[PDB]
Design a binder for this molecule. Structure first.
Ligand code: HEM
Length: 148
């Protein structure tokens, strides 16, 4: 549900070089999307700025960078908020607003959790942090879906 400050600090330390600049945070998000869209090319068309793109050219698009940055920034927001119940709930509310009335469904949203989790597990060094990010993202994405 929840992460301790120590856990957040450990996770952020590993992510520091992926998230230090706007360009890097954007590239981190694009990398998640490359994985998501390879697994679900039908999801490319869900995004207003990716209309017309396919699995063969989405990775090179300007549009994927727009979402890569929004996604990356929000993921770091969620992580930083993980030890503060009220701020985390604010982010979960924003999550629901971000995804309500969109082509993505509740089931597709929670169903994509393993893609995000496995991506982050790859970037983290300590097994305890790999375990932690899994618990956290599953919790967050279920909470967002429930409000949709
Ligand atoms: C915890 C994981 C996720 C986070 C933090 C997140 C974050 C965001 C953010 C910040 C936006 C707003 C972007 C904007 O300003 O337009 C957004 C929009 C959107 N997201 Fe996510 N997202 C997540 C997972 C997913 C998944 C799994 C999907 C499945 C396809 C998805 C699909 C969408 C769609 C369709 C929009 C609307 C895009 C548009 O046309 O403007 N998201 N998301």
């Amino acid at each position: 549900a929840v992460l301790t400050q120590t856990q957040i600090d450990s996770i952020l330390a590993d992510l520091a070089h992926h998230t230090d600049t706007t360009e890097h945070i954007t590239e981190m998000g694009v990398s998640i999307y490359k994985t998501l869209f390879a697994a679900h090319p039908e999801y490319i068309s869900y995004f207003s700025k990716l209309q017309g793109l396919t699995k063969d050219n989405v990775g090179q698009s300007e549009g994927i960078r727009y979402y890569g940055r929004t996604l990356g920034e929000e993921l770091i927001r969620l992580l930083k908020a993980a030890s503060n119940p009220s701020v985390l709930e604010e982010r979960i509310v924003q999550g629901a607003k971000d995804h309500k009335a969109r082509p993505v469904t509740k089931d597709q949203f929670t169903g994509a959790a393993p893609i995000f989790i496995k991506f982050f597990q790859g970037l983290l060094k300590k097994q305890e942090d790999k375990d932690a990010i899994e618990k956290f993202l599953l919790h967050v994405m279920q909470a967002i879906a429930a409000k949709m």
